[PDB]
């Protein structure tokens, strides 16, 4: 059907790891859904020590928003480079079919904007990132990804194809950071993006992270910014990485039904304790909570995450159940 | 059910890679299984040059022992820490539900004792290490993590929901050392834990291993201690690794049913020859030998099993099939 | 039976990434299937700044040729391995059971030959390498290796069970080498390989690769040298990688069916972005092109694929359809 026919709903972005409202089962037909996007370049902290990047961002944010729609709807992303950036930016889409996922349609010098539609035909997770032509790495690893969410028209269905509902759903972007160092090890600083990028290029080329970080900073995902549910609550967790394998573990939980490669139509692998999202993937993991507290959500590489920063927290409220776990002797001595 | 009323068994734990005596299909219900590990840090032999590290142990070993439980039985641990040990030590159990899989209600000292029980819920192979607030990888690189196998009620079951039964169980862990080196490449050597800990923590940050082994050393399963089977015999080997990603290979074999990620109410993966493990996890897989000779099971970064010590050997007795492979013509000039 | 009464074929191989002629559906019985491998030790131009190794090759190509056959033929290779070469070589089949996958019956010196036969059991795309003992990741991250697929007899099923039918095949050999380099960073010139060995080891001991590439160089799958189709063209992509992860990525396409781990009694794996193949594995994905155009096929590493190597080309010719992606506005000043 002519695509002028179709209903058109606006998205509002909201910030990581939170994600904008929107149905689970589909309760329009077909739509046309817009999104707005505008690239900002700016400084951004993204460690204890006061580590400051020069950071490629979607909408002001490391990572770019969660966009949600469903199966078969069309997407049509206004993309915005303001005249305050210095460089050139685009978009690929993984959850998009040609041109190199929309890249080579959306190509924007500062000053500039396009519009992009593409049919979203697959559900699933999927992540979309910057590849500007013999730039991709540098611009991806600077922060400019993000991930969309295509539902089935019909909701997540667990192994045997009954309903799974969420009752709250998050995002967590895991960036990999390359800050070249110098031979004693210390961090250099650059006075423009040009004179940054070789250097860039060698520190990306020793494919060991200076940083890995949720929601762009060592401690985002902590604290007062801490994810939070109560006992008995069904929680969505997706979680996307643009270039590097990651492992997400929940301490003191699983994934009850885990799509670690981020696709609806296959059977989600149930009571995992720990699953691989590839690099240049977005997987999805649901949990119900059993137990209040403070868990830690964290790459299971646990170098990645206590010492270069892949761990957050979340706290939940409710009842202890000591049928499941009760300390039956306190630590004391003998 | 009230936990009293219920029966309980003791278990006496064996070093890797053997595995205390279980019942694959459980001949009683459920039941409280009491463990109890003695936590040793001591020094360690790790690779043929001679480098001695700290290690810490549960129970001597690296890794810790094998735990085999059923679903919906309770693991009643009794951990000691005793006085000659110098570190505050924990546990987390990623088969457990809250409080951090445990570690949050197991803190001891040296001195002190406690005693843990949870309600082992999910099916699978299931990590578990050492998680002390604020030093959680260097304790599991030092060696401080095993692994706890939770089986169904009634047994291992096929892609097809048919009974699948081991003759042999070998529980293989592979450890990720970290041994700081100094500009010139040696491997430095520390007074105390205190002294050693910020270059522990600046070589961790590099993400290169200087050793990886099976059963704490290299060579460790090789010769004398090669793993045995013969021709015809149903093998399970339970593979755990609580920091890194490793990718199990049999040579001149395969992984008949593997559960690659080790969790049992999913179908296993048939035929593999090589299986992902990620950090964090541990995986099981079965296969039924069809040849005699030498095999060697080893971590398929081959970098990681020749030379760094991810590489183990099985010596297998029975008849030679000549219609599975044959030298039609042995080496020999033209 | 008896195998001197089977049918014999003999295959003549072609250089990756094209694959020698055969039958998706097995048009015969059970055969024995003949190949002959030559062994060339041979200088080549890896980048585009000319760094030359000393290349080890089955055939004179990196990766090897892909061997095709179906399940429950037999393999016999004859590997001659020429007076012209300097060192001792073997093979190693994934797909095969028992003697190290052969290469304890296959060990021959320059100027030596020999012809080992196994029976192909399993149906799935395996990696075969050289493995000569005490030298296995120095002869496979030289070059030595490649990739057989042994078919189900009825050909490839979807996960339903109802017939996959490709209409061209591609293999993409991916390999990483470990140049070795200098305290100043540049790559390290060598007189004979006997004088290069303890300095491969060490670069190699980095676990840090100094290209990754597919088909032996950099660029070698772009230009004149892309891979092609057709919109509407059903095309499998058979991708090895014989001792490191990798990452597949279509970039403005998909997976519609994925074996990630490369074993056709699996199920295949639904619309994937992009699928992990664990070193030491071979898999397979089949693509529907729906788009015309240039498509990059990488490594979703994306430091990996832009500045180590590992990208290629897809040239798709046909219609251009609007519905599924069009540029609404194109990118213009406001
Ligand atoms: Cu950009
Ligand atoms: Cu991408
Ligand atoms: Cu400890
Ligand atoms: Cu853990
Ligand atoms: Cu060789
Ligand atoms: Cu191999």
């Known amino acids: 059907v002519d695509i002028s026919t179709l209903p058109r709903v606006k998205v509002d972005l909201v910030k990581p790891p939170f994600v904008h409202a929107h149905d689970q089962v589909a309760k329009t037909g077909p739509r046309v859904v817009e999104f707005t996007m505008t690239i900002e370049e700016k400084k951004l902290v993204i460690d204890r020590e006061g580590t400051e990047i020069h950071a490629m961002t979607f909408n002001g944010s490391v990572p770019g928003p969660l966009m949600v729609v469903h199966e078969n709807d069309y997407v049509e992303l206004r993309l915005i480079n ?22 080579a349609l959306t190509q924007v010098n500062p000053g500039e904007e396009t519009t992009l539609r593409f049919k979203a035909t697959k559900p699933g997770v999927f992540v979309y990132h910057c590849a500007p032509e013999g730039m991709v790495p540098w611009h991806v690893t600077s922060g400019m990804n993000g991930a969309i969410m295509v539902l089935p028209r019909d909701g997540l269905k667990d192994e045997k194809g009954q309903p799974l509902t969420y009752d709250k759903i ?34 990306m080329r020793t494919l060991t992270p200076t940083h890995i970080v949720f929601n762009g900073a060592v401690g985002a995902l902590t604290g007062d910014h801490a994810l939070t549910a109560a006992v008995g609550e069904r929680v969505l967790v997706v979680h996307s990485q643009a ?32 699953w691989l999202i590839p690099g240049g993937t977005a997987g999805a993991a649901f949990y119900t909570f059993r137990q209040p507290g403070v868990y830690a959500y964290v790459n299971h590489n646990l170098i990645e995450a206590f010492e270069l920063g892949a761990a957050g927290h979340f706290k939940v409220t409710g009842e202890w159940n000591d049928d499941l776990m009760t300390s039956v002797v306190k630590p004391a001595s003998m």
Chains 1, 2, 3 share one sequence.
Do not use: C, M, S
């Not at 993984?94 to 890249?103: C, D, I, N, S």
């Not at 990999?176 to 423009?192: L, Q, S």
């Not at 699983?254 to 304790?273: C, I, M, S």
């Open 82 to 103: 303001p005249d305050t950036n210095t460089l050139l930016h685009n978009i690929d889409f993984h959850a998009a079919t040609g041109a190199l996922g929309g890249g």
């Open 243 to 274: 270039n590097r394998d990651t492992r997400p573990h929940l301490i003191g939980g699983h994934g009850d039904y885990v799509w670690a490669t981020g696709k609806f139509r296959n059977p989600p692998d149930l009571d995992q304790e720990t």
């Open 170 to 203: 998050y995002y967590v972007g895991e960036q990999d950071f390359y800050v070249p160092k110098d031979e004693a090890g210390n961090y250099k600083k650059y006075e423009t993006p040009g004179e940054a990028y070789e250097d860039a290029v060698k520190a």
